Design a binder for this molecule. Structure first.
Ligand SMILES: CSCC[C@H](N)C(=O)OP(=O)(O)OC[C@H]1O[C@@H](n2cnc3c(N)ncnc32)[C@H](O)[C@@H]1O
Length: 527
């Protein structure tokens, strides 16, 4: 047993944060959260990637030193993510000294086992992606200022030629072993098809990788290569090591580091259980990262979730679709927008954000299915005693609904683990819709007069239903799930832990929380 260790990719500090990074870190957060709700110990980890030519030149463009610039931008990121009301255990920065120590340690480790040598790289490169590309991965396209240039087929950004004496990691040595790892662990890359892509790529062949760069090129704004000040460590070998650094930092109550353990075992975090990333950076996480680790005698991660790219109104996120997530959060609600991001598309798909679409999913899932159920379920009209009634005899119809509620956890457990947050959300909302049909059917408004003894069995099942679903929706709706429980008057101990996935863990005679006359759970908006 280990600390469950979930990651978010650390982001380039060249520009303000947006929905893309909020999205990636939310997925990180939800996986971390669910596992905590399971009662497991967890370490979630978002951060910023600060070194390298991309950011270095981003600082030059804004007429200011990288030190001042990166600190400032990295600050916008901590602010955004604080306001997004997450629950991550650390915000890492590659400018941090303890990190640098680890990168140098890893570098040395790799050198030691003869898998780094001094070579050349003569080929293409995208500064904007800090990615080496082969000629097949570039095409003709327009420079800014209209000039003919070469653009990346992956990114679309400008690619410049590079002819440098660089340090080379022996990636080609590791293709057969990588291929075993992909096959030995047929669920280590999700969604499935993105796995297949990785395997096709590795099936063809791997060249050795340039893991250092000419100091000059980077504007001296990267971690030096050990034993050779003339070089700096490739931004990605630096950036990828952030996962190993967070696994070795010890953190205090204010979220600041205090110490860097010598060994990764001391904190029982490494290797990552889930590396949430974007499809755009798969090759580094699924080919490079594991290759480095094997070289160095380290463990490999368990799972890499590579997701799709958001767009707004089908047009791509605006360099020049203004998208402030914190405002859309203030507009519609923070849990509401978290939900929408997680529900509106799965990891296989390139989601398309639309205000009107979210108004729909708010008004017709959160408000009208979930919210609606709760408002009836807890009411002086139906629940005249404001308690949890004792169940009478169970109808077969009762037993059907219950079986759905008994099963619902085990199913969502798989989907959360896959991970597929979408097929875990619907899974719950299938059970919420059922619970709702049942109640319309049983007509408890009528039963309060005809058959109070039967109304006990109806109200109780509903309540336990609404409870087990809300419990399993916690990581999606962290703040509203607490409001739901408060209305239900569930004890705090029954809001966490697998013991409370059991049907009927809250016993009858439990008193409902106070009834506020205005209290609406989710607010129906204009179309
Ligand atoms: C070892 S980690 C080093 C990573 C490196 N520092 C880096 O890649 O920096 P970066 O800010 O350009 O990263 C872009 C990342 O943000 C998300 N993302 C961005 N745009 C998105 C969108 N439109 N939709 C969904 N997700 C998006 C997505 O996760 C993608 O990988």
């Amino acid at each position: 047993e280990k600390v469950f260790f979930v990651t978010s990719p650390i982001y380039y500090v060249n520009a303000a944060p947006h929905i893309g990074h909020v999205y990636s870190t939310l997925i990180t957060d939800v996986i971390g959260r669910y596992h905590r709700v399971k009662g497991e110990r967890v370490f979630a980890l978002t951060g910023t990637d600060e070194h390298g030519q991309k950011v270095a030149e981003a600082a030059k463009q804004k007429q200011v030193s990288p030190y001042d610039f990166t600190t400032a931008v990295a600050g916008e990121f901590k602010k955004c993510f604080e306001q997004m009301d997450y629950s991550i255990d650390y915000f890492i920065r590659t400018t941090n000294e303890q990190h640098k120590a680890v990168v140098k340690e890893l570098w040395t480790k790799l050198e030691q086992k003869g898998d780094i040598y001094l070579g050349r790289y003569e080929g293409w490169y995208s500064i904007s992606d800090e990615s080496f590309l082969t000629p097949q991965n570039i095409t003709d396209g327009v420079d800014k200022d209209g000039n003919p240039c070469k653009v990346s087929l992956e990114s679309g950004h400008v690619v410049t030629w590079v002819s440098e004496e660089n340090y080379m990691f022996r990636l080609s040595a590791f293709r057969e072993r990588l291929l075993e790892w992909y096959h030995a662990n047929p669920g280590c890359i999700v969604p499935e098809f993105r796995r297949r892509e990785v395997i096709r790529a590795v099936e063809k062949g791997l060249p050795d990788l340039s893991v250092s760069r000419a100091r000059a090129t980077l504007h001296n704004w990267a971690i030096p290569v050990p034993g050779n000040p003339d070089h700096c460590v490739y931004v990605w070998l630096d950036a990828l090591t952030n996962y190993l650094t967070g696994s070795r930092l010890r953190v205090d109550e204010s979220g600041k580091e205090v110490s860097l353990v010598d060994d990764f075992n001391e904190l029982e975090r490494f290797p990552a259980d889930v590396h949430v990333i974007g499809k755009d950076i798969l090759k580094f996480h699924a080919i490079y990262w594991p290759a480095f680790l094997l070289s160095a005698g380290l463990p490999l991660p368990k799972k890499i979730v590579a997701h799709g790219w958001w767009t707004k109104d089908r047009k791509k996120i605006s360099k020049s679709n203004v998208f402030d997530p914190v405002e859309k959060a203030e507009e519609f609600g923070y849990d509401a927008l978290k939900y929408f991001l997680l529900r509106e598309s799965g990891f296989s798909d390139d989601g398309d954000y639309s205000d009107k679409n979210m108004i729909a999913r708010l008004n017709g899932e959160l408000a009208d299915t979930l919210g609606n159920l709760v408002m009836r379920c807890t009411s002086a009209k139906i629940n005249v005693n404001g308690e949890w009634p004792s169940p009478a005899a169970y109808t077969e119809e009762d037993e059907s609904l219950i079986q759905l509620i008994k099963d619902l956890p085990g199913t969502a457990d798989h989907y959360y683990l896959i991970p597929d947050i979408q097929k875990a959300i619907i899974a719950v909302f299938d059970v919420l819709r059922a619970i709702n049909a049942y109640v319309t059917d049983m007509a408890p408004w009528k039963l309060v007069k005809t058959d109070p003894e039967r109304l006990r069995t109806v109200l109780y099942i509903t309540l336990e239903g609404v409870r087990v679903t809300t419990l399993l929706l916690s990581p999606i709706l962290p703040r509203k799930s607490v409001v739901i429980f408060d209305m239900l008057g569930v004890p705090e101990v029954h809001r966490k832990g697998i013991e409370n996935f059991e049907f009927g863990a809250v016993p009858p005679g439990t008193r409902l929380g106070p009834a506020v006359e205005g209290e609406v759970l989710f607010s129906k908006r204009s179309t």
